[PDB]
Design a protein around this ligand. Structure first.
Ligand SMILES: CCCCCCCCCCCCCCCCCC(=O)OC[C@H](COP(=O)([O-])OCC(O)COP(=O)([O-])OC[C@@H](COC(=O)CCCCCCCCCCCCCCCCC)OC(=O)CCCCCCCCCCCCCCCCC)OC(=O)CCCCCCCCCCCCCCCCC
Ligand SMILES: CCCCCCCCCCCCCCCCCC(=O)OC[C@H](COP(=O)(O)OCCN)OC(=O)CCCCCCCCCCCCCCCCC
Ligand code: SF4
Ligand code: SF4
Ligand code: SF4
Ligand code: SF4
Ligand code: FES
Ligand SMILES: [K+]
Ligand SMILES: [Zn+2]
Lengths: 263, 95, 176, 125, 154, 207, 94, 114, 114
């Protein structure tokens, strides 16, 4: 009854009021590019990778945050949308370090993959890059903060999901730095999940460091026995060896998180 | 430095050495254990630390296009040195 | 356009006919063929005097593999595993971990030289020029097991051949 | 002229598979879970069939991972669950079907970050 | 040719040996010199040109008896035409790049890969995952030296 | 004329589309689908009963004259009820054109042998039987062609393992080559290469 | 190249050619084995402006096949008849 | 025009009386097509292209000029094609492919990719 | 449930083809042992033939039976024409296989395979 009508590339779709442009695209099987947006975190709207053209609107909107209005035609593949993605990806990679061979994220990196699928194929940045100092937040999460793209997923997860207010940004402008400011360890029981939600290799697992690459792991979907919650997990193995433990999405149990002990 | 275990078998730079009672060392009987004696961990520690003037320095490993991808190293932490993640050279901000 | 390789009608004048009768009976075209091999008998043969003389190669030659170093003596390989992923023959096997100083380095680097197709993809994929195919082609062995290289063997190959490897890379890297 | 055949399709006797790897195998029919390291969902579209993991041991010469399982790397792709189940029946494999997991729809509100009186008010941006 | 072409022993071993009619060659699936030996005027470099074959001049040898000797003469004359083409390629070689300037397919230069973030990402991805190819199926063929060589690629 | 993009040839696309509907008009009994690809390749998809009538028409009809069978192969698609797609690639020297004809079958259903239309098909159909197990009816001499004598299974099926089920060696005791269950000193390493991000929107499948 | 004049004459007469002009052994007419460095050109897409990838993306202009007929006026041929080849003027008869 | 000595194709004999042979074969094709229903596209299309070829033969008494007009290679190739067409027309009567589609394919039989 | 037959329209027709194949295999064994100079007896070979026929005695699809007979006939043709070697003929007897115990305990001791 309350459902309004919108269009994705001219295809009609019925959505509830308050649905975002990103969620309307989800219905027809389109996945808008993203970095800051996470469906289990509060909306941020800062990476600007989800910019999409609305037909007849001169300005692209941030799909992750903009609520759809009745009758909108979202153009997910327009020349305007495609140029917005290339421009934003260009800004993301301008100061990003050439770390992929030594970066544990390589091969399962959303920055690599969305650069392949939505960015340009070359650079025109001719300057020196930003370099940021690293920060210790305990024995579980290694931080290479030069790789951070300031998506603020970790900050939002810690505040909303883990209920811990230690992470935040300091400074402003290009020198805005995600961290704790003071020397502090982020030692929650849910801390290890910030590795998963960080789209880049800025936050990675210290125990897992350097040991494998994503393509070569075999994925075994199993269950955790560290407690009685029954968290669903993926056991990554390679050549007969357990390499790491990853969450497996189950809406009715662990959603997409696992405890540190489980991890 | 290459070490010899109490069984006399050389220890590799990866720490591998058949323990006493491992039949697999019979493969070396009448032959030899191929061991590289230029331990890279030792060689890189002999390099002097390079003092620089800026807060950020870049390393491509030397030789331009014959080195490694160019990276940038922050030198704000004065307790430790900035190390190149590719080649292991160390850098220090002079005062 | 096209041409006919065999569509010529021979002339039937008594001179041409008599010329062919002489060819049939006096074997003139078979004698002519003997002239050609006689001429070769008095040509200098093309044989080189191996192993004292070698055949010519180029700086791009794809031979035995070796793991290289930086001038300091540090290994170039950072266990990125790009070579292992691209290897068409799955001839490369790698394991890695943080070194005692935190460096990202391999603890296993095997090349099964009886799987390898000497295609050079691994040295194209390497971003730091760690794994190369050197110029050596004279390393035949008496056992199969001697052709299963581990990291110690490949590092020794790098130290053994680095003087030549560096000079060949210097001559060809501007084409890459 | 068509004939009336009235039995379930069984091709086990004409597939050439050894008896061991029909009766002793357990096939899993499932849609792969999303790799949690990435947000892309394009690897959760198709159904997969995999077989139970068997022993891998270390090669004495080199320490490589040896196997005696001819099906260790066999993975099949299907459009639908029914297509995968139909394939498993005619080949005579015992199978387990896991239902597809679709993310539950969420209600997202940017304006909720600045609530006047609710706990959704964020302390930082 | 001074050893074979006019040699009566060679001609005795090849002339009227393995004759194949033009219609049989087609219906049996023959191609290349196995067609042209029998007189079928057909050469994929002329009729379905690829790369820059439309920009070189060469003749297609054609047989008249469909036997071993004619196929021998066709192959020898094809070698002469190859030299003729090679002379044109040497003279008309243009400058420029050697692989498509599109780093989502062809890898970047090593110097670029070690300097540019985009180049490193694309180099990394091309040598691990490789480039994705749009869904489809093609049968593509060339005039290989032995005949029509093609791939049906899905 | 952008340097890196393959040029599009529309005169051929129209010509192939015209001939495609020409074939469908003449053989409605068997033709199920006709399509032309963006690189200008015409494909006719037919009912398997029409293999001989369709191929004979294409070989003999004055406006077709597809005298040469370039290739005859099969593709295994396990998700389909009829898993085996049979593909005929034909060449017309007269009209300097190519056409692809496709049909389907399953494990237990035969296909009429096209040898009477093209003698080239004799070995192609032996290869399809050997590698996929698709039986061809009234074939002059159907039997394995590529696999070893006594080999069991059809290797090019997607559910046949890459390394097979058995392997050979010489056993000194019995003084002959023997076959034994396959064991590998190093297991083939499966790689998961697919990116989780869609690459080609134009081919997106509706949900 | 070191053969004497008599032997040069003899193998020339026996072969019926002037073998010396086109020796099959290479001497110093070949390129030097040490060459100067190249400086290779760059491609058309090496521009700093007017170079958006979405205007030069071949893979994304590929489209699914056009369905002409799906079972879900003059006669035509697949293409115009091939022209008859003309004989070579370079050398029509070998 | 003087009669050829060779057609250039191995096994394809030179025809002494091409015009008459073509008229015989084209007439036979038209006779065979009379037994196919008037609505069959095979009949309408084959009759049309046949009548155009026959009209050329009746209007061009020179074998060289006629070959140029027919665009089917040597006139002996054209005779062979006429014979092949006549063979097809007889077969089509048994097959009757003008009938409606025998069977629809399964739902996703031709869907690609999966 | 109406499908195209391969040869036999029903099980009774298929079974006749099976017995025709079995007779051919039964008659051929003495020649195979003689021609290949096998050390087995004619009884051992004929027992093996029975064993290969007995393992497929539970089939009730006439099409599956027809394919088995088709593969059996091809299998016999290779033997008669000596396309097979002795190694191929003796692969039916698995002479170098160490017997694999089939009880729970013996399996339990040797490994994890069920
Ligand atoms: C029984 C028969 C055998 C015994 C008879 C022995 C006769 C004497 C042989 C002397 C050969 C010495 C060759 C020589 O000088 O080496 C110099 C050579 C240095 O010269 P070089 O710098 O290399 O340059 C060579 C010429 O540029 C490149 O070489 P070239 O091709 O210019 O030849 C040079 C010279 C070499 O010829 C000779 O000196 C010997 C001629 C004897 C002819 C007998 C027939 O030939 C000529 O000058 C032309 C006249 C030769 C007669 C040709 C007749 C052809 C046959 C007619 C055609 C119909 C055939 C059917 O030094 C050596 O390598 C020494 C090698 C020693 C080899 C053994 C020599 C002894 C031969 C066997 C003796 C019995 C044991
Ligand atoms: C006053 C009255 C006088 C009366 C007497 C007058 C007689 C004079 C005229 C007599 C004729 C002279 C020739 C006699 C020699 C024999 C000629 C001969 O037999 O040649 C024909 C033979 C077959 O050739 P073919 O063309 O294939 O067959 C005919 C086609 N239906 O061709 C062949 O034999 C082919 C041989 C192939 C093998 C050749 C390999 C060796 C060639 C090099 C040897 C050179 C000669 C060496 C002689 C050594 C002497 C010590
Ligand atoms: S985060 Fe991604 S793009 Fe950045 S260095 Fe790591 S793998 Fe490369
Ligand atoms: S550390 Fe990772 S999750 Fe946190 S803001 Fe940076 S990129 Fe985002
Ligand atoms: S040369 Fe080719 S096959 Fe050999 S190790 Fe390198 S990538 Fe693998
Ligand atoms: S040799 Fe090169 S490509 Fe291979 S793992 Fe080491 S750094 Fe990576
Ligand atoms: S996903 Fe919308 S701005 Fe980040
Ligand atoms: K991460
Ligand atoms: Zn460095």
């Amino acid at each position: 009854s309350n459902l309004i009508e919108v269009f994705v590339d001219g295809q009609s779709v019925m959505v509830e009021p308050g649905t975002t442009v990103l969620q309307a695209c989800e219905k027809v099987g389109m996945q808008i590019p993203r970095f800051c947006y996470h469906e289990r975190l509060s909306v941020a709207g800062n990476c600007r990778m989800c910019l999409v053209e609305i037909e007849k609107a001169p300005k692209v909107v941030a799909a992750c945050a903009m609520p759809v209005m009745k009758g909108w035609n979202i153009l997910t593949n327009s020349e305007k949308t495609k140029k917005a993605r290339e421009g934003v990806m260009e800004f993301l990679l301008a100061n990003h370090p050439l770390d992929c061979p030594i970066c544990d994220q390589g091969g399962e990196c959303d920055l690599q993959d969305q650069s392949m699928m939505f960015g340009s194929d070359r650079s025109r940045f001719l300057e020196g890059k930003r370099a940021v100092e690293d920060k210790n937040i305990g024995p579980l999460v290694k931080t290479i903060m030069t790789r951070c793209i300031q998506c603020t997923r970790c900050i939002r997860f810690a505040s909303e999901i883990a209920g811990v207010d230690d992470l935040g940004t300091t400074g402003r402008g290009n020198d805005m730095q995600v961290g704790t400011y003071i020397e502090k360890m982020f030692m929650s029981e849910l801390s290890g999940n910030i590795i998963d939600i960080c789209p880049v290799g800025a936050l990675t697992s210290k125990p897992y460091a350097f040991t494998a690459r994503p393509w070569e792991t075999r994925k075994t979907e199993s269950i955790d026995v560290m407690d009685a919650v029954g968290s669903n997990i993926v056991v990554s193995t390679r050549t007969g060896e357990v390499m790491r433990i990853l969450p497996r999405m189950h809406e009715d149990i662990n959603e997409e998180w696992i405890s540190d002990k489980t991890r | 430095g290459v070490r010899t275990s109490p069984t006399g078998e050389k220890v590799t730079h990866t720490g591998q050495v058949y323990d006493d009672g491992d039949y697999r060392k019979v493969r070396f009987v009448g032959r030899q254990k191929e061991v590289n004696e230029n331990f890279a961990i030792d060689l890189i520690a002999e390099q002097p630390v390079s003092q620089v003037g800026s807060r950020v320095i870049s390393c491509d490993g030397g030789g331009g296009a014959l080195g490694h991808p160019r990276v940038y190293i922050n030198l704000d932490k004065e307790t430790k040195t900035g190390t190149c993640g590719y080649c292991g050279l160390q850098f220090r901000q002079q005062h | 356009t096209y041409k006919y390789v065999n569509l010529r009608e021979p002339s039937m004048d008594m001179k041409s006919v008599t010329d062919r009768a002489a060819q049939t009976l006096l074997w003139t075209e078979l004698i002519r063929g003997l002239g050609m091999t006689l001429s070769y008998l008095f040509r200098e043969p093309a044989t080189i005097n191996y192993p004292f003389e070698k055949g010519p190669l180029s700086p791009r030659f794809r031979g035995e593999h070796a793991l290289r170093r930086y001038p300091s003596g540090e290994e170039r390989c950072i266990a990125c595993k790009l070579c292992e992923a691209v290897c068409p023959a799955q001839a490369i096997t790698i394991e890695a971990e943080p070194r005692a100083d935190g460096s990202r380095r391999t603890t296993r680097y095997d090349i099964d030289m009886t799987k390898c197709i000497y295609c050079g993809f691994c040295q194209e994929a390497c971003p730091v020029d760690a794994i190369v195919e050197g110029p050596n082609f004279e390393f035949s062995t008496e056992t199969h097991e001697e052709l299963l290289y581990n990291k110690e063997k490949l590092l020794n190959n790098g130290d053994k051949w680095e003087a030549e490897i560096a000079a060949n890379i210097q001559a060809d890297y501007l084409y890459r | 002229q068509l004939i009336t055949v009235d039995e379930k399709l069984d091709i086990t006797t004409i597939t050439g598979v050894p008896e061991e790897h029909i009766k002793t195998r357990k096939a899993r029919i499932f849609v792969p879970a999303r790799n949690n390291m990435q947000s892309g969902v394009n690897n959760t579209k198709k159904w997969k069939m995999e077989f139970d993991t068997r022993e891998r041991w270390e090669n004495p010469l080199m320490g490589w991972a040896s196997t005696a399982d001819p099906l260790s790397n066999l993975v099949l792709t299907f459009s639908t669950k029914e297509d995968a189940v139909a394939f498993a029946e005619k080949n005579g494999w015992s199978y387990d079907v896991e239902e597809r997991k679709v993310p539950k729809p969420k209600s997202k509100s940017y304006g909720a970050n600045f609530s006047w009186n609710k706990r959704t008010r964020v302390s930082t941006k | 040719e001074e050893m074979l072409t006019n040699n009566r022993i060679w001609r005795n071993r090849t002339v009227d040996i393995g004759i194949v009619t033009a219609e049989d060659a087609l219906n049996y699936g023959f191609s290349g010199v196995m067609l042209r030996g029998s007189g079928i005027q057909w050469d994929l470099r002329k009729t379905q040109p690829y790369d820059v074959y439309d920009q070189v001049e060469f003749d297609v040898p054609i047989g008249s008896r469909g036997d071993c000797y004619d196929r021998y003469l066709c192959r020898v004359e094809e070698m002469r035409q190859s030299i003729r083409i090679i002379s044109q390629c040497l003279n008309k070689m243009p400058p420029g790049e050697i692989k498509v300037d599109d780093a989502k397919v062809s890898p970047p230069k090593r110097a670029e890969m070690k300097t540019s973030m985009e180049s490193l990402i694309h180099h990394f991805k091309l040598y691990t995952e490789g480039y994705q190819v749009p869904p489809g199926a093609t049968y593509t063929a060339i005039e290989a030296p032995k005949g029509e060589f093609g791939v049906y690629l899905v | 004329t952008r340097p890196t993009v393959r040029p599009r040839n529309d005169v051929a696309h129209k010509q192939l589309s015209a001939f495609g509907e020409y074939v469908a008009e003449i053989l409605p009994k068997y033709v199920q689908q006709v399509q032309v690809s963006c690189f200008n390749e015409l494909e006719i998809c037919i009912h398997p009963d029409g293999v001989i009538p369709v191929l004979t028409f294409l070989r003999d009809h004055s406006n077709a004259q597809f005298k040469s069978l370039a290739d005859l192969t099969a593709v295994d698609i396990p998700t389909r009820q009829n898993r085996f797609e049979i593909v005929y690639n034909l060449l017309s020297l007269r009209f300097n054109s190519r056409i692809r004809v496709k049909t389907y079958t399953d494990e237990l259903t035969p296909i009429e042998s096209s040898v009477p239309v093209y003698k080239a098909a004799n070995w192609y159909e032996r290869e399809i039987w050997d590698m996929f197990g698709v039986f061809f009816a009234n074939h002059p001499d159907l039997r394995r062609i590529l696999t070893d004598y006594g080999f069991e299974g059809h290797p090019f099926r997607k559910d046949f393992p890459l390394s097979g089920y058995v392997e050979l060696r010489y056993d000194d005791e019995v003084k002959r080559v023997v076959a034994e269950p396959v064991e590998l000193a190093q297991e083939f390493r499966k790689f998961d290469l697919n990116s989780p991000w869609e690459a080609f929107p134009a081919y997106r499948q509706p949900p | 190249a070191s053969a004497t004049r008599f032997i040069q004459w003899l193998r020339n007469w026996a072969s019926g050619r002037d073998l010396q002009a086109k020796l099959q052994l290479r001497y110093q007419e070949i390129s030097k084995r040490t060459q100067p460095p190249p400086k290779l050109p760059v491609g058309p897409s090496h521009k700093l402006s007017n170079n958006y990838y979405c205007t030069r993306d071949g893979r994304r202009e590929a489209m699914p096949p056009s369905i002409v007929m799906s079972s879900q006026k003059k006669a035509v041929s697949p293409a115009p008849p091939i022209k008859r080849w003309e004989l070579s003027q370079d050398e029509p008869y070998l | 025009g003087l009669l050829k000595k060779t057609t250039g194709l191995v096994g394809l004999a030179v025809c002494e009386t091409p015009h008459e042979r073509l008229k015989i074969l084209y007439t036979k094709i038209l006779d065979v097509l009379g037994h196919i229903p008037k609505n069959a596209a095979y009949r309408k299309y084959t009759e049309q292209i046949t009548n155009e070829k026959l009209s050329m033969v009746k209007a061009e008494p020179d074998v060289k000029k006629l070959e140029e007009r027919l665009q089917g290679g040597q006139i002996e190739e054209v005779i062979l094609q006429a014979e092949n067409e006549l063979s097809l027309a007889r077969k089509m009567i048994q097959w009757k492919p003008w009938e409606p589609l025998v069977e629809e394919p399964p739902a996703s039989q031709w869907k690609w990719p999966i | 449930t109406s499908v195209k037959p391969i040869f036999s329209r029903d099980m009774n027709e298929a079974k006749r083809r099976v017995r025709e194949l079995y007779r051919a295999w039964y008659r051929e064994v003495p020649n195979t042992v003689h021609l290949f100079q096998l050390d087995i007896s004619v009884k051992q070979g004929r027992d093996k033939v029975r064993e290969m026929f007995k393992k497929n005695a539970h089939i009730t699809d006439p099409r599956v039976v027809d394919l088995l007979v088709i593969k059996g006939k091809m299998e016999l043709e290779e033997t008669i024409k000596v396309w097979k070697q002795r190694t191929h003929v003796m692969r039916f007897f698995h002479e170098t296989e160490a017997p694999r115990p089939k009880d729970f305990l013996s399996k339990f001791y040797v490994g994890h395979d069920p």
